[PDB]
Amino acid sequence: EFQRKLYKELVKNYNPLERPVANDSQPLTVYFSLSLLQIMDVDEKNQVLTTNIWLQMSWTDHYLQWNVSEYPGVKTVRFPDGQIWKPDILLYNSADERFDATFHTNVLVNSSGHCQYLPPGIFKSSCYIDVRWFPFDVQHCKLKFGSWSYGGWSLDLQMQEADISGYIPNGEWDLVGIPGKRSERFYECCKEPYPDVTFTVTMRRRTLYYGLNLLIPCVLISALALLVFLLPADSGEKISLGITVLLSLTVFMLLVAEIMPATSDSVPLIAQYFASTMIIVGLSVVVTVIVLQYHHHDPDGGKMPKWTRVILLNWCAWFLRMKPDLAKILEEVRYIANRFRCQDESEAVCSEWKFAACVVDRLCLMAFSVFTIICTIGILMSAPNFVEAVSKDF
Amino acid sequence: EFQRKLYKELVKNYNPLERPVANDSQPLTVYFSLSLLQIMDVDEKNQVLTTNIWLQMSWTDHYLQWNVSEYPGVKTVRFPDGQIWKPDILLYNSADERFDATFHTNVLVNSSGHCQYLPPGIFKSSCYIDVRWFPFDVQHCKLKFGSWSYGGWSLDLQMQEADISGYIPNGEWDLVGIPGKRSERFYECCKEPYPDVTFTVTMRRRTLYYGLNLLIPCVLISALALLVFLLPADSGEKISLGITVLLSLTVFMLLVAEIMPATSDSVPLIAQYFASTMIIVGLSVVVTVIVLQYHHHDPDGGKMPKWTRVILLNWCAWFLRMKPDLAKILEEVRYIANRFRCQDESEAVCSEWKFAACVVDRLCLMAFSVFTIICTIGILMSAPNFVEAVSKDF
Amino acid sequence: EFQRKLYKELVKNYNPLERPVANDSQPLTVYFSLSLLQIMDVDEKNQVLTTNIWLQMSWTDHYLQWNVSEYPGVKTVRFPDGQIWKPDILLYNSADERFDATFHTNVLVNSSGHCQYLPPGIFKSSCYIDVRWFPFDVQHCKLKFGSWSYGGWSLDLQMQEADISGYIPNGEWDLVGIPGKRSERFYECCKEPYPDVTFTVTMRRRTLYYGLNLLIPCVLISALALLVFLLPADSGEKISLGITVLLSLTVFMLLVAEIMPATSDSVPLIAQYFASTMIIVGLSVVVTVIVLQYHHHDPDGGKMPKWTRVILLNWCAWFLRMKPDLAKILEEVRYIANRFRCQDESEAVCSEWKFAACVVDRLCLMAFSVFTIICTIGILMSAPNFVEAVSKDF
Amino acid sequence: EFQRKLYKELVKNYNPLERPVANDSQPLTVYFSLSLLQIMDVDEKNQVLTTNIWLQMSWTDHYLQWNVSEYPGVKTVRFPDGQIWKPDILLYNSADERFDATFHTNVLVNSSGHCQYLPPGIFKSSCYIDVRWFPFDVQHCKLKFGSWSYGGWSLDLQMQEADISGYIPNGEWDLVGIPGKRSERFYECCKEPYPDVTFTVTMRRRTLYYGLNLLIPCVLISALALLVFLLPADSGEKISLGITVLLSLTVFMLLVAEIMPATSDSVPLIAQYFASTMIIVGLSVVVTVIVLQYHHHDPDGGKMPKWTRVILLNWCAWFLRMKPDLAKILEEVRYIANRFRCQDESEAVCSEWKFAACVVDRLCLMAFSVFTIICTIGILMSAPNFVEAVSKDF
Amino acid sequence: EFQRKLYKELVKNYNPLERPVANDSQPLTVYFSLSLLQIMDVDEKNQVLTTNIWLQMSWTDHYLQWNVSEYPGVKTVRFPDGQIWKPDILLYNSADERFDATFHTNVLVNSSGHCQYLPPGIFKSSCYIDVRWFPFDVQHCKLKFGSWSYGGWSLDLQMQEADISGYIPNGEWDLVGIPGKRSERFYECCKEPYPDVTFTVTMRRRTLYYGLNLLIPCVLISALALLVFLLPADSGEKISLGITVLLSLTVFMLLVAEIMPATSDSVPLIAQYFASTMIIVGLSVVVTVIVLQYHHHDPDGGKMPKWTRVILLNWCAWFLRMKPDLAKILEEVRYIANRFRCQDESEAVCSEWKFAACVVDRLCLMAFSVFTIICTIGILMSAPNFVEAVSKDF
Ligand SMILES: NS(=O)(=O)c1ccc2c(c1)[C@H]1C=CC[C@H]1[C@@H](c1ccc(Br)cc1)N2
Ligand SMILES: [Ca+2]
């Protein structure tokens, strides 16, 4: 009875094109906020943030007022899209192919004319994703909202603190906060200023998954490259191991290229770490070729230089704690014995070249072990958020 | 005749904006339920559940009533979207880019004013997918439904048990149940409580496919890594086999990373199993380098330590059940025979180092076989649903 | 003139909400059929069938009738969506994100009131895809159509044989038939039965492409694994070949996993075939390790057991048709000659162990060749449609 | 003034449901054509053609006529969708999920009632893509247009030559032509014929990119397989090279499978070329195993058959232009010299087996070089468009 | 009060179909411009540019004028889509499946009748992407805008300089400029000219990411191929290293094929660079086979040709700075000594062939190092933008 009479009365002469102010010279105050339900996806490669959000817009409609004593039991009415005036607030940095992603719900109006409007949506927003410290990164994504066609002389947009009480945590991103800021900017289109409300989502990447799939495996595979310096040269498998480990490390290189955006702003931390590991494994292969040159050195070729025999066989080795008929028969027997003596001298020269290969192999093991530790620790601990990451995620 | 007259009469003054209650102070009772037709997809990486569902909403429209004696043969009428008042029930945790995925069908009304509305849809809902026990996991996905703009003072939302009579089984997921719960929550937006109806789909993953593509292949490939400890050192192929098996096991590592969500909540069971298998294969390569160091040990270098010759060549070996002219001619002939004697001593020292490599190789085979069995069985049987999985799926 | 007058007359008091029957107590007869133009896609992994179809719905509108003598030259009229009553027939097992995929075209009405309505669409339907016999599989996909809101008391849905006269063959699927069945089911929603018309598309997979990309390559690569048993042990490349062939066969394993649905209903035929080939190649590697143990057997170690020397060197080999100063000088010369004699005995023992490796290698070649043929032929010919496939596709 | 009066007058009693003919018995003539702007994509795997096209439809509206002298300055008017009668022309073989992809623009009408309507769109059409001669293929894709609900008794559809003056060339496809054909077909739905206009896009694939990424790399990698026949057997790397080259050639095999449709109509040219190259590389590995059997042949085993020593060591080799105390001391010295003589005989038998391996290796190099050239040239030049391709693209 | 009266007055007799000119014979002037907010994506493979743009259209509506003194405080009004006449300006080279991607916002009108309309959108436009100099490329993408149905006699389209003041830089593309050009073209459809406004986005690719993921890794891996010429032949690992490096370089080849469009207009710079590196690595493998032929040369076979012993062992080597009872006993002892002498001659011939392999190996190292440097530097510096790229990006 009374609900049916109130709806009929309220729409008499109501024009949804009219900004509902009693005084046309005064701007209308609109309070804007949001509730963050969930961070659905962070697309680093496309530089897009997907969120599940409830916008909250409240204002006063001067015309949608009634005396509740004359309509007993009718405290609120509801209006769908296009039947009541609404603010045209949009996300400026929308990345959605439709631009506007809001699902239009009802406007709730109470007897004094206060209007609530809480449309939900899955919002896709353009966000600069800084991968300088990936995977120990903190991202600051901005959601910029404003009335598209109403400047500050017509619509006084005010801000209210974002709601996070219903937020559902993402397994990958720790929410730090969503502070808001209300600004008033001039655009070359228009002489009137246009206020906006910008919410910045400060989120922190949880690093367990990337430690498991990116960091740890690289550490262990680099460790196996160091085994080349232990494999005896006579196994004939030194090169196989080294080059095979290097060719497997490109799998992680190509993995990183697929996830990171193709930007030139900085070299990502993970890229530095992987590039430095692969360069150390590449240099180990170079060193292995030199070690094989000494082990297979032709005895009848050159002679161990003086500097080789002192630097390696003396200094480095110490430091490493390594350390008539009867006359014819005589002529033939003496030839056979001298041939053996000559072979003994040649094999003693070969043994000296093989010792040099072992020493260089032993010196390189230690040197390359030190380079790996320093590079690994130095690169990883340069990240401002590394200590916090290991504390919370491991 | 009568159908045409009833439709004309029913819409006289009908306002689709009006909640159809006789008494405006009383809330309207709405019964909500669903029929689950099919679980279409579970996206673990995006944390989304796709379902084919028929929502069921029933209420009473006070105005859509008629005397069937005055309209003989007209027991029901039908109204499309926007011509009859409807409840604005939505899925709160929708992940669909349009948010609302319901296909709007007719409302069926009978002569006493009871309204049925059974809109179908393909629903995408945000679901926390716990991969702690993957692939022996049980997921609990929630579908939360509620009126968006009508609080409990206007719309009394009641629940009815979900229908599963037309459910078509998914080859990958066994449906355990879909219990519902009716709650009444307060939101900071509004002083009025808002009831919701939450259906939790309890589903169990069928594990045959993952046993075939993930578990079994890992077991067999780990088994082939143990063959290194049987390959004679003189084949010159020990390292090739080991490192090749390790480099193939990253294929499964990268396979798992592609399917699992990048979350830091827990280390998945499958990750533990694969990480522990690869670490055992990596340690086997380390042990192989030590075995090759003993087999290729230079006889003129150090001497088998005392502890090496007792621990290995005695204890472990037992346990493993392994076990003037004529004078010149004399001088030259004696040199040739002593050179042979010296070679015999050196090769007997080399044979002793080769036996040590064999023993260490034999001890490591047994030890690594035991580590594989224990790790494999221990990790797999820690899953609460492992026994049930093998009973039903294998 | 007359076309303009007929349209004006026909819509006078026409209500598109009214089921167009003269007698409101009688159900309306609707004839339903379809024309299958093309099978666009079969998504085995998502279990979805995409088709290009023209629905055909015909009924009688009691009100859309006229005397053609009073409107000379006007034999038919046309009405778009929402201006004429239409049946609300939907595909029940739609997999489309919009659910309803029909493109709404005109309804054609002739002077006696017979209405034709032939809306086209690209339909996505949920279909159980049985991969038990893949790639020699026959699929039966169901298209279930019915009025959503009109039960059998209001709408008498009848079936007509599907049209295939304009069907364009798919290169991958041979159409067997599209029989239809008209049923009448009860639903817990409603006390009234709801008739449906189900068209089952029986399609047969053409197997040339999969024979070329899956079967043939597996056969040939398995054949190359058998070459290990021919490679002399002294080449030092037996393990490289075997393990390399095994590591390449996982490419096909991972290929199959990507195309097949992750279901636990059955082990696909192709999975059996590939799993059995890889297991045979894996066992060949195991056998190769045993062959290398005999070839590299230390002569001073154990002695060929009695059972080894009879089973292999005798039986299997036959079957395989394999088959004072002068005294000191004497003491030194005799030592040199006895050392040679001892070496000859040791190398004759080594030659006997190498012959055993060759025999075991020759016995294993034949045995593994037989296992490959039996497994390959036995698995492939277990498929009920294998004979037909080779007849028609190869 | 006059524009405002003309629009008001023109819509008085205008019914957009009415086919705008003065005489209702006569069909309306509609001229149909298109402008091809760009070939956007050819999806061979999904068998879909995407084009950017401007449809052109012109007819006469009997009612939209005016005297320009009474409306000075008003030569044309414009009407949007749904306000003026339009032809319902659709693409029959649309592959778009929405079916109709036309963006509805204005209809332009001039004072004599001639109507122009030029709606643009991105059209996706089902096209049989014949991959028999890929990548030297010429495709003929059909765009079939017709009125959906107006047969030839109501709508006389006529054709006009397609416009290509604004066509932008695709880097991958050379446009040969777009001839049109106007037909009149009967459908089982309807006793009336329905005319259609079919435009066939004849396009030719430009082959530089595929020559660079598919053909050339296969040629060079096959060439490297022939190097096995030059590698000395004593390098111990013959098998590594051959099997490694074969395992890399599956990369191109799997590349081709990903781009080609999974059809059984024919074996694509590129598949023949790659399959024949891999089979030649596979046979080279088989031949390498036989060459290693001769090189490692045990001297104490069988004896070079008579046919082996003539066919290879004589004929093929020529063609290839290859080519008391003192008595005891005597007994021991004579044993040492006879042992050397026996070793010399055995190594001379081994040298003869090694020469056979070299000859077979040299004969196989030439034979396999000839098979590669013949197969490569023979397969590639069987394509009717190969000569034109190399002329225009290389 | 006054806002409500103005809206009611303004729509009295307003026809949105009417071009709002006072004089129907005169064309309406429309000013068109845009603001470029962000370059979202450049799809080289699909040849599509995605941008976030605000179109700016301004004109004068003769009818939407009022005296502000009679409506105090009402300086502007707003109208949504379909209520006010608007220009139908579209992007001609749209690649969006919907064609028109504009999100329709309000039109702002002030008291003198000046209309502003600034609709935003995510625009996808077809763009020829020239990959001749990739990754040192500069792209010129065109955005062509024009009224679809209003020719130059009705709509006088004028241009204004594009706004870039709010442009947000892309990490991958440096914006050079967005100049505009206003043209007037004739189309075969129509005798009237149709003006357009074309904005050309000149953008430059930032090359740090591609230098890191494409160029640098290729340089280093090619460098490791040169190590083969240092590995002693007796290591038995020369072929493994070379062929393994070649088989890894196809990873980058296949990477490039995936990103580049499949066009035949030119061979991309990156393709030249990678193809030339792989050909040099392939030739190194060929040279390695020749080096192994000399190292393993049978001493009893042919004799080092005269030209081989001078060109290599003399010239190249210098340049490279390489450098009764007693009678029987005599007969047997002399046989043993002559056999040793003969072996010494054979091994001295073998040492001469091994020296030739070393020299050829040393000459090839230098030659191949020079080819790598020349090819690398020559190809990279042929790009007109290479110098600028290294200056700004590295
Ligand atoms: N995708 S691409 O950048 O155009 C590209 C990159 C590298 C590359 C090609 C294409 C092919 C085109 C010509 C050589 C051929 C290939 C190759 C294969 C084997 C050997 Br041995 C040598 C060279 N090298
Ligand atoms: Ca799943």
Ligand SMILES: [Ca+2]
């Ligand atoms: Ca193509």
